[PDB]
Amino acid sequence: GSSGSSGLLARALYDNCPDCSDELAFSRGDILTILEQHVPESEGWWKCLLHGRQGLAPANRLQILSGPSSG
DSSP states (O other), X not given: OOOOOOOEEEEESSOOXXXXXXXXXXXXXXXXXXXXXXXXXXXXXXXXXXXSOOEEXXXXXXXXXXXXXXX
């Protein structure tokens, strides 16, 4: 099987103010779609998609929301 770039969802515990495109610009209470976690380009970052942003996000401010069923 080809496991990777599945697409998870994370929450925003705090708004993010990115200075460059690389990073993503989100605001508290925003559901970001974690396209992929395995990001060798940025250590400790998550590639999410919002309003056509396609930027990374700090895993320190992102809460990986996982389902209870078959968790």
